[PDB]
Amino acid sequence: SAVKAARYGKDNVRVYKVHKDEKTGVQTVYEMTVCVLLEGEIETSYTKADNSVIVATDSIKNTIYITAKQNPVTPPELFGSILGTHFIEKYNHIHAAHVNIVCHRWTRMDIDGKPHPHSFIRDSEEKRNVQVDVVEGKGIDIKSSLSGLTVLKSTNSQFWGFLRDEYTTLKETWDRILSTDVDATWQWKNFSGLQEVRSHVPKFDATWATAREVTLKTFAEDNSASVQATMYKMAEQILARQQLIETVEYSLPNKHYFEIDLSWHKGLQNTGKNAEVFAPQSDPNGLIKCTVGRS
Amino acid sequence: SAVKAARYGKDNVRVYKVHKDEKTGVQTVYEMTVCVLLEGEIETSYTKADNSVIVATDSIKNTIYITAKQNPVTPPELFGSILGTHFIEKYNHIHAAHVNIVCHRWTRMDIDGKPHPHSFIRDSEEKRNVQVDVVEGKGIDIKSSLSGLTVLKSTNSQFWGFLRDEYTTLKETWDRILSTDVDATWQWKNFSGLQEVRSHVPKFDATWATAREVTLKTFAEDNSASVQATMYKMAEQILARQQLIETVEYSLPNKHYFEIDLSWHKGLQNTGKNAEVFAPQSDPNGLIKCTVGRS
Amino acid sequence: SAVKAARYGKDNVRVYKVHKDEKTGVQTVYEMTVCVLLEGEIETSYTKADNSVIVATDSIKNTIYITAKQNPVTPPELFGSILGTHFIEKYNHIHAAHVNIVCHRWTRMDIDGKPHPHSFIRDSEEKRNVQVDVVEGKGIDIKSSLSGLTVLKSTNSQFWGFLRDEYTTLKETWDRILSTDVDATWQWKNFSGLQEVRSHVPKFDATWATAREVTLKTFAEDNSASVQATMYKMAEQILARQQLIETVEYSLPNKHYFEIDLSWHKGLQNTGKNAEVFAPQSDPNGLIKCTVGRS
Amino acid sequence: SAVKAARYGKDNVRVYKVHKDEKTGVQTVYEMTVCVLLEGEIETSYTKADNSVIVATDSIKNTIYITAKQNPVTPPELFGSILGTHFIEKYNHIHAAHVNIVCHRWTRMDIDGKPHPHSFIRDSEEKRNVQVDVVEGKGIDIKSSLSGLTVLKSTNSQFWGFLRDEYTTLKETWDRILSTDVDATWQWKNFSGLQEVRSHVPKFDATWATAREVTLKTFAEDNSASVQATMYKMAEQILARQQLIETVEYSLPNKHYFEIDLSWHKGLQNTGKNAEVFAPQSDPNGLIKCTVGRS
Ligand SMILES: O=c1[nH]c(=O)c2nn[nH]c2[nH]1
Ligand SMILES: O=c1[nH]c(=O)c2nn[nH]c2[nH]1
Ligand SMILES: O=c1[nH]c(=O)c2nn[nH]c2[nH]1
Ligand SMILES: O=c1[nH]c(=O)c2nn[nH]c2[nH]1
Ligand code: NA
Ligand code: NA
Ligand code: NA
Ligand code: NA
Ligand SMILES: [Xe]
Ligand SMILES: [Xe]
Ligand SMILES: [Xe]
Ligand SMILES: [Xe]
């Protein structure tokens, strides 16, 4: 037998950083969960019990904190690239670093119509994420994403004209509820290294904001023919607005809300045009994915 | 042996309701999870296998949907009181109904600065809850609450002057992070029945809004001497603003963020006044509770 | 306003302890999650910012570890009583301690038919729990429980003869699936203090074992007329076997498995006597409770 | 823009099946969660709102139940292959089916030393899983796995001789706790189609049993030099025992248990050779992966 692939590191490293403006007194907080996995010439740790090749996962944890102390942690695409580059430059035998960052929301509170200098609220479990793969001699590959964005529209969704055969019971509909949890990923063109990532720093926050705005507006305004058709419209617009993105991937559950027939009870009308009370279904759920790229 | 207490019913009943304004085209959605447990002369179902006394839990589920179809579901204090009253009036041998409702957030989306007529976002897992106990001959007892409100302040929290003995290692501090998940419950004076609950309908939403506003403002503005002292200030203000509340209960975790000493690494300074990077602790956590009532 | 009730302490304290037999080489591990909340003359910490009355929650955490180092951690009823007693004896102004312990399973592995001296498996998320309330001048109240015991029987459950009215759609049945997660609590007679708890130490493990055995056997063998009737049989037997128990409480979800009518597809028969494939329902669920005591 | 990749289907489909032996009266239950995603000539559903190419996800759900009614559901490798093949054969324009199955444990109860005919317990959240990819013209690729197998050993784990530099604080150790949640996957050689999968049916259950047995024995008996070295030993043995496996992948968290220095309290000795009470750490955790194949 032989080692075909190996990676190891530290997962679930929670990090908080505060920035204090001494002039204004305003404080800004960042909180992340970080994972770093390394690859390289480490096979002998597995095959021969040779620990000399192992950068301890505990040391990887220390490095994450030290790097956060000495560098900006925002945008996460930059922080991830700094962190990954560190490992491939410091250790001759490490040739790839894989950095995953989940950013948690701490939104500044408004008190009496004014932004508070040092108080924050977690407004939703929506996350902003990055996956950064730093590979020696091959540059830096960055996938940016938003996830956990949960939305619902109560009308202006349709689903008719699908294949009907002996396995089909679903009725066609011209008016239904559509609800989903949005997972959207945009993949950047390969960057040659840290200098190039630094040169594009302003684009990271702007593209995240654009992706979020396009997702929300398209969901709200599209008279949806299907989840498939609506998600494609979203992806098309993001690619049109940022030339440095190569692909956009959406993964969307279809979280079903079922009509409840109450006619058995005193002829009560609660279906079709009379539907007011519905039963949200926890499972099963549709799952629709697509990756959109350039012509 | 004898049955000392018994209750049974249906838990985890998910309900969605839509209201459609035909004039404006504006739609408003409500989504809840409901639990209903009944008590009464039902001992024989346990002791003698006498099912004749059992209103099937499946029927309780049907009743929740029918009641939602025929009545407003907001404020939840009203809906819960209607639902509980139904069971004690319909069934001679049922003498108490216990209704728990969790309300999920569906906040109307703003698209291009305008409120959208039929599109909604889940902005946080904060819940608004009610517990309604309807007891035949003893009226209606309502506890209203908010939960899952997660906040953090990065300064203006202190903790010094506590008891020090041979079990104590904690250092006194004049500047720390304070973060918590707020669970706040206000208990209404007993209501004589549904007519009285109806008479106070406007107070329910207003008191929830007040409780939330007082919680946020006090947290943000108090130069906190302890979680204990800050929570008491919150409770005092709520009781002052709504005479129909008898008690306010807060239950607050103290979610710790620890300093990280980096001095071992090239003399790096990251403690006390130089603290920038912290380690959020998943566990253990302080847990502080208090119930405040009137003199 | 006035403080009506207050308690505070440390939650989610994870503790592991190993016992090493030097003679045999056999090692035995225990792992728990502990919560300790205190009450007493502490109102001034809330009302006047007087921290002098506060035993820091951090110190409570230290105390849990020190107490585990110096005492047996099994049975948990004993450990909880030692821990609670410590606080009321050490601190003049603390008058009640509330200790909750969750015990996690680490079951010794069998390798090649022999018990391994130092290797363990988590066989299920079933827990053994204790709640110990130590109140100065009023002794020690102990509630012991098992929870997270998940079982299913595929036949020998019935449910017919229930109330039928205009809210009822449920069909009577003489053969159904019954599945539940068992939560069972036995409450001990009040103990005068630690000496009395020590005197009954062998009864704690034996009663837990009896409660588990009675639950499993009764579930498996009863031709169940309802969840209500089966749970009562369980409780009756436990009370008969341990005179020092005052009450037994069961709380049982009814986790539904629905028939799937496939007749629309080529006349396929999958209901009643022909039912083979079912759809487990995540929600809603029946919830049935009862507390059984002595005549 | 263009669709680069697309797949869609139904996730989280819970299925239960019972087998009844009429001769012996013995019943056997199976419970799974199933996901099926399809690929093929479906781009126009995304780009042109052409639903005619869509097999509704609701119909996919129906198909899972019908297929379970008409076929064995065990071993899951066979059921998954039947299910996937169905879609590529039935629908001309569907060219790949991806089937994921999670099998839940229902272990027959022993009552008074005898196996019960129709009563079952969930002994742990350990799962047996399959991923089956059925691709038209390219056969059937099956990855089998076990996950959620949680183990701990209290001694006979070491970790010394790792790289030490200015980022390192971890002390070398010759005796530590090792605990992990095992995720192990074995990938079968490509099968030409359903006939070939059928021909190997007995190997599926036997290989799962072997993988589990090798994992447990190696964990228990290895005087572990590192997680890396121990996991490699496991993988090597599985590959030696089943020639139809091409690769074995392990993914193992290192769930840390930290010593607690109690020396500050009355010189209490609880480190190194005197360590008895430890603090389990919820996060962060080491994460170690490896894929082992043939020379
Ligand atoms: O077994 C281990 N492997 C590792 O790579 C490691 N790093 N820190 N501790 C460790 N333990
Ligand atoms: O065992 C049961 N008890 C009940 O109260 C009930 N209600 N519906 N089905 C039921 N099954
Ligand atoms: O606000 C606090 N209250 C307490 O009781 C406590 N104990 N440790 N830290 C603390 N912080
Ligand atoms: O938008 C939808 N897309 C689908 O593929 C589907 N299948 N059933 N319902 C559906 N809704
Ligand atoms: Na390198
Ligand atoms: Na009544
Ligand atoms: Na005392
Ligand atoms: Na095909
Ligand atoms: Xe969508
Ligand atoms: Xe607080
Ligand atoms: Xe039961
Ligand atoms: Xe391991």
DSSP of A18-87: EEE-TTT--EEEEEEEEEEEEEES-HHHHHS--GGG-B-HHHHHHHHHHHHHHS---SHHHHHHHHHHHH
Cα–Cα distance measured from residue B135 to residue D31, given in angstroms and rounded to the nearest whole number: 42
CA A52 → CA A56, A276, C292, D161, D234, distances in Å?
10, 67, 63, 6, 22
**Which run of H or E residues covers position C231?**
helix C227-241
Q: Which of residues 171-210 of B touch C (CB under 8 A)?
A: none
Cα–Cα distance measured from residue B268 to residue D169, given in angstroms and rounded to the nearest whole number: 14
Classify A270 as helix, strand or coil.
coil
D37 touches chain A (CB under 8 A): yes
B273 touches chain A (CB under 8 A): no
3-state helix, strand, coil in chain C (%, to 5): 30, 40, 30
Structure tokens at A157: 């969704």
Radius of gyration of chain B (CA): 24
Is-cis flag, bond preceding D72, omega within 30? Answer: no
Pocket residues for ligand 2 (CB within 6 Å)? B 8, 54, 56-58; C 159, 170, 226-228, 254, 286
**B10 is annotated as an active-site residue:** yes
**A57 is annotated as an active-site residue:** yes
Structure tokens at A78: 């930059």
Q: Is the CB of B179 under 6 A from ligand 3?
A: no
Cα–Cα distance measured from residue B105 to residue B124, given in angstroms and rounded to the nearest whole number: 7
CA dihedral A227, A229, A232, A238 (to 10 degrees): -90
Which of C184, C276, C275, C178 lies closest to C222 in space, CA to CA?
A: C178
Place of tokens 């119509």: A113
> Vertex B65, ends C262 and B184: CA angle to 5°?
125
C168 touches chain A (CB under 8 A): no
Cα–Cα distance measured from residue D151 to residue C11, given in angstroms and rounded to the nearest whole number: 25
The dihedral of CA C21, C22, C23, C26: what is its sign?
Answer: positive
Please, what is the end-to-end C-alpha distance for chain A in angstroms? Answer: 43
Determination technique for this entry: X-ray
Of B14, B18, B275, the CB nearest to A154: B18
CA dihedral D82, D87, D89, D92 (to 10 degrees): -170
Classify A191 as helix, strand or coil.
strand
Cα–Cα distance measured from residue C145 to residue C132, given in angstroms and rounded to the nearest whole number: 11
Which of B118, B199, D253, B7 lies closest to A35 in space, CA to CA?
A: D253
Which of B288, B286, B196 lies closest to B235 in space, CA to CA?
A: B288
* Phi-psi label, residue A124: left if phi above 0, alpha if psi -120 to 50, beta otherwise: left
Which of C78, C124, C69 lies closest to C99 in space, CA to CA?
A: C78
Place of tokens 């003199």: B295
A68 touches chain B (CB under 8 A): yes
Hey, which CATH number is domain D1-295, 3.10.270.10, 3.90.420.10, 2.40.390.10, 3.40.50.2300?
Answer: 3.10.270.10
Q: Are B71 and C182 in contact (CB under 8 A)?
A: no
Cα–Cα distance measured from residue B73 to residue B75, given in angstroms and rounded to the nearest whole number: 6
Look up residue C247 and give its DSSP letter: E
**What's phi and psi for C37, nearest 5 deg?**
-120, 135
Of B167, B264, B282, the CB nearest to D169: B264
Of B65, B265, B277, the CB nearest to A68: B277
If you measure CA to CA, which chain B residue comes closest to A113? B217
**CA D70 to chain CA centroid, nearest Å:** 26
The strand pair at D94-104 and D27-40 is best described as antiparallel
If you measure CA to CA, which chain C residue comes closest to A167? C265
Cα–Cα distance measured from residue A152 to residue D176, given in angstroms and rounded to the nearest whole number: 50
D59 and A5: CB-CB below 8 Å?
no
